[PDB]
Each structure stands twice: as C-alpha cells, then as structure tokens.
C-alpha cells in the first residue's frame, strides 16, 4: 500500500505529492493520464511555445446555446505537470476579495490573509535587470513575493517596441501603472509575471519544480500514462483506486492507500472520477445504473471558464520588430533564435504571440458611465434564470450566493472583471474573467474511456454580454488613443470601426468568442452541502471519509486573474491541512 494516492499529476497533484513526501515515512503514488514531457523546445523555450503537444484528445463541447449553437474543441492538459507544462506561463494571483468571498460562502480559514503565506511559500521571484525594469516600467513589491519556494517566476528579458505604444495608450484611457498585480489588486497595466526560471530562461512547470527537483525521493512514486477509473471504498471510507492504461488496453489494477485518496484530475477530470465512483447527482447515477455512495447534486455542476475574444487588426505603420516578425521574417527569427541559443537574450524569452504587458479592469473602470445599469440588470434578475429549470434547489442556492458575491465585486473599484492584451502583431485579446454563466460536465456512460459531456453554457446569462461588450469598447479606446494611433491600427473584418452599436458589436462577438482559455474550474465546488457544494472547507468530499479534491474543481468561482498561481498556492495550503490532520513531518 501507499500512504496517499493522488489521481492526476498536474499542478495541484504534484505540488501536494512533493510536500507530503517531505516526510520519509509517507509514501505517495501519483497516477497521471499523460506521459512525461521530453524537454522539447516547444515546452521549455518560451518563443517556441507549442501547447498542442499534450492536449487531451477527443474532447468537444455540446452546441453552445449562447454562441449560435457552435461546438468547440475543448482544451485541457494530458501530461505530467498538467496545465503548467503547456500553458502560456502567465503567473498572476487573484484579488483580495476573491479569497475573502470564498470564505464568506461558508468556508472557515479562507481569505486573502490566509492565502498570502501560501502564495509566498509557493515561489521564488527573480527580479528583472535594473535597466529592463527602468526602460520597461517593471515594478513590484518585494515584501509580497516569495524568495525561497519551488516555483520560479520572473519576466522576459526583452520587450517589443510596440508594447511601449500600447502601455502609453492604456494610460491615456484610464488604465494606470499598477505597482504590483500580486498585491491583491491590479487596476490598470503591468508586466505579466512569467513562470520562467531565469537561470536558463526556460519554463518552470510543476514537472520540474515539484517532481524533478525532489525525484531522488524513493517515497515519491509516479505512474504516467494511466487513468484513475474509480475510487474504491470500504463502506463510506475511500481506501484505493482502480486504474487502467490511458491508451485503452483491456486491463484494470487496484491499488490502496492507508490514509487518503486525493483527486487532482482537473475541472474536467475530477467530476468524472466522482460520478463513475457513485459520488454525484442520484438522477445521473440512477440513469447509468451506478450505485449511489454519496448523493451530491453539485458534482459536475457550476462549470466556469474565462472566455476569450481575438480581435483582428491591420496597421499602416506598425513598428519593427514585433511578434509577427518571428513568423514572417526568417532572418529576424533566425537571428533571435541564435541570440537566445548564445546568451539567452531577446524575443525567444517571451511566450510566442504574447507581449510583456497586460491590463485588468473593474466593471466601473471598463464602463464608468453605465456600470450601475449593468449591476441593476443583474440585481433584478433571479439567480435561478441562469440555470435550467429543475436544477437541484441546493445548487441554485449556491449559485445565488456566488452571484451575490460577484455583484458586490461588480460594485468594487478594486476587483477585475476583464483583461486586455496586445501581442504587438495582428490581433488583440479580450478576456472575460467573471462570467455569471454556469455550465456542466457529466459522464455519458460507465466506460472510463468515454469523454464526458462538456457544456460551457457561455453567454447563457445575458448579463455576460453586457460586461463583455463594455470590455470590447475599452479595448477599442486603447487602439484609438494617441500613442496607438501613430501605428495606424484599424479593426479588420469581421469587426470594424463601422460597428458602432452594442447590437452590431455583440452579434460578431457571439460568433467569435471562445468559451474557454483552458481555465476550467469549479465542478466540485467548496461550498456547504446545502448550497450544492461537493467539498468542505478542508476539501473533504461530503458523505465519505479519506477523500479530498485538490485541483481547481474545488473553487467556488473564477478569480480576477488566471488560475495557475492559485492552483500552486491552494495545493501548498492543502498539504499543510493534510499534514496537520495526520500528524506528518
Ligand atoms: C493551453 C493552456 C493555456 C493556459 C492554461 C491551461 C492550458 C491547458 N491555464 C490554466 C491552468 O494551467 C490550469 O487552470 C491549471 O493547470 C489547473 O491546475 P489543476 O491542478 O486543477 O489541473 P491540471 O490540468 O494542471 O492537471 C490535471 C491533470 O489530471 C490528469 N488527469 C485527468 N483525468 C485523470 C484521471 N482520471 N486519472 C489520472 N490523471 C487524470 C490530466 O492529464 C492532468 O495532467 C493558464 N493558467 C494561468 O494562470 N496562466 C496561463 O498562461 C494559462 N494558460
Ligand atoms: C529558483 O528557485 C530556487 C528556490 O529559491 C532557487 O534555488 C536556490 O538556488 C541557489 C543557487 O542556485 C542555492 O544557493 C539555494 O540553495 C537554492 N534555494 C533553495 C530554497 O533551493 C533558484 O536559484 C531559483 N532560480 C533563480 C533564477 O533564482
Ligand atoms: C440553437 O438550436 C436550438 C435548437 O437546438 C434552436 O431553438 C435555436 O434557435 C438555435 N439558436 C440559434 C442562434 O440558431
Ligand atoms: C514607461 O513609462 C513612461 C512614463 O512614465 C513612458 O514615457 C514610457 O514610454 C513607458 N515605457 C514602456 C516601455 O512602457
Ligand atoms: C527582417 O529582419 C532583419 C533582421 O533583424 C532586418 O534586418 C530586416 O530589415 C527585416 N526585413 C523586413 C522586411 O522587415
Ligand atoms: C465595414 O468595415 C469592415 C471592416 O473593414 C468591412 O468588412 C465592411 O465592408 C465595411 N462595410 C461597408 C459597408 O463598407
Ligand atoms: Mg539582478
């Protein structure tokens, strides 16, 4: 037997396995669906970014009722290190009120102040060079960035010149410099912290910082290329798991843990393990003939992501070099790759297609003249209208609680609802951080090789379109500001300056929005059981003993920011919770 078995070797699972195996008396088995990465350039080198190397195959959404019934390919990692292995390395904490709100939903021990020690413990920040900090407007507060923890993060050591135009344009339209976006607020523009190891200017993914770093430990066991297919019980006690080869060989193996089973299989994986195991909504489990171990209607409910919109541009006077120089100028690309190979300088330190700066804004910063109209519309509408009729009443109660918390965030000048980015080339990105829409992820069969049904339900809550239209208009203001006008941008079809009304703009958005930036969360939510929760404040699955959820399935709702930094810090926190319960060193 092992002390602990962890299902999924992504950010959360490897962070937890690392910390638990600090005690040589504790043995851990991590079972991971994907393989070990091969250290290929597309993983290690930011400018060679090739995320598609390790996407989970064969996942498609249902037709999206709020997006003209489009079906989309679903993106999530299948690799040791999970999303950290293949993500764009953007390393950002949420805002204070995200964590405070999670506590106020009925979760003792959750707040910004309780998470800050774990953010610090998780990481080592390496400052940029002084010349780059001064030239680039890079600032930080060293008092709230960790100096001793495993996750290395820093910045690229270069910026494209057009990023200066965009910074100044953003400041011209009311997005000022942010001292430190890791300090719990991020209203304006800042350099993107990047999960890069500055010694080699390579990706610091969880495979490296929470497995390779400690891989001499005989008590830290990994089994790549295998799927956890079921949790095994003795009564209501979780005692082990069944696993199969990911590749579909007709073989099943049982393995047992003396203390606990931890699920770390991600927003789209954890609810499937639970449902196949009889932990889930009795209606679904009964329809598939699965015996009910714990009747939890929240499992696979409450799916959230952070939608994205790519706006195309043409320019009369764009500045050289820019990110698109790497794809259209073989001489520039070769010279930048030679520069990286020699002295680790230049464009290849930036994740391909990204720039170095970004902006985040509250609803009142996006829409100073109309945010109170959006809040009124959202306040007037019953929470229940965002969910199908016959949604479990407990799940509706938890959604109403989340919705009330998010409407307080809409009123708050210090909480973000949207992100704007320009990579310096032919497109800008606008991200909707705080959707009120909620989706589902449900098994369709008892076959553990069958994809679940994934329905994002993007844009089903009509408030989302009002927020997202306001974010689009703020992006347009940046591109129309003096410092950007000198590059001669214009929106290209299917957008364009000739789309002036909300109706005109949103009809194109409805056709172009991507439901997902692979930020899937919240499908095994940490809320009281009577609010449709799946886990307690200690991340224990209701109705069973010895079973926790570590991956971002547990989150109640999306952050003002992208998930990775909090995925690491939440696993650091949970490792201490588990150590305390079991008296571990
Ligand atoms: C392409 C892309 C790009 C981005 C991002 C993701 C992706 C895929 N994200 C999101 C972020 O990386 C993601 O939210 C976290 O990795 C989630 O961490 P978890 O531990 O919850 O799951 P994670 O996805 O890391 O790990 C879950 C693991 O479980 C495994 N698994 C699933 N089912 C299993 C089963 N039954 N048995 C065994 N193993 C199983 C999977 O193979 C996977 O490795 C991101 N975030 C951010 O902050 N910055 C960014 O730049 C980006 N960009
Ligand atoms: C990545 O973070 C680790 C952890 O802080 C850094 O590791 C330190 O490395 C130095 C010199 O390499 C050693 O003297 C220390 O013993 C290490 N500390 C720990 C806590 O392991 C590493 O330096 C970081 N990378 C960069 C670029 O700073
Ligand atoms: C989407 O499909 C449903 C039927 O599945 C239909 O009622 C609806 O009109 C369609 N929506 C659009 C935008 O075409
Ligand atoms: C940095 O900010 C100053 C204004 O304080 C501005 O003049 C300059 O262009 C900015 N540079 C970049 C690279 O953002
Ligand atoms: C291509 O890049 C090279 C190397 O930096 C530069 O000298 C040249 O002017 C570029 N050509 C064009 C057409 O941009
Ligand atoms: C509106 O602008 C777009 C983008 O340039 C273009 O596709 C379209 O033809 C324009 N409409 C008219 C009527 O000119
Ligand atoms: Mg230095």
Author numbering: 46 to 630
Quote the passages of the study that discuss this structure, keeping the authors' original sentences.
A series of six crystal structures of CtFDO complexes revealed five different subsites for the binding of aryl moieties inside the active-site pocket and conformational flexibility of the interacting amino acids when adapting to a particular ligand.
Cystamine, which was used for CtFDO complex preparation by co-crystallization, was found to improve the diffraction quality of the CtFDOdegl crystal, but without any electron density being found for the compound. The structure is presented as the ligand-free structure of CtFDOdegl and is referred to as the CtFDO:free structure. The CtFDO:free crystal structure has two CtFDOdegl molecules (chains A and B) in the asymmetric unit, with an r.m.s.d. on Cα atoms of 0.12 Å. The cofactor is noncovalently bound to the apo­enzyme via hydrogen bonds to 13 surrounding residues (Ile56, Ser57, Glu77, Ala78, Val124, Gly128, Asn132, Ala133, Val135, Val273, Ile597, Ser607 and Met609) and indirectly via 12 water molecules. A composite OMIT map of the isoalloxazine ring confirms the nonplanar conformation of the ring with a 20.0° (21.4° in chain B) bend around the N5–N10 axis (measured for atoms C4—N5—C6), which indicates the reduced state of the cofactor. One exception is His564, which is always modelled in one conformation enforced by the stabilizing hydrogen bond with Gln351. The active-site pocket of CtFDO:free is occupied by water molecules, two of which are in the CS. The first one, the active-site water molecule (WAS), was found bridging four atoms: His564 Nɛ2 (3.0 Å; 3.1 Å in chain B), Ser607 Oγ (‘in’ conformer, 3.1 Å; 2.9 Å in chain B), Asn562 Nδ2 (3.3 Å) and FAD O4 (3.5 Å). The second water molecule, which is more distant from the isoalloxazine ring (WDAS), is bound between WAS (2.4 Å; 2.6 Å in chain B), Asn562 Nδ2 (3.5 Å; 3.4 Å in chain B), FAD O4 (3.6 Å; 3.8 Å in chain B) and Tyr OH (3.5 Å in chain B, 4.7 Å in chain A).
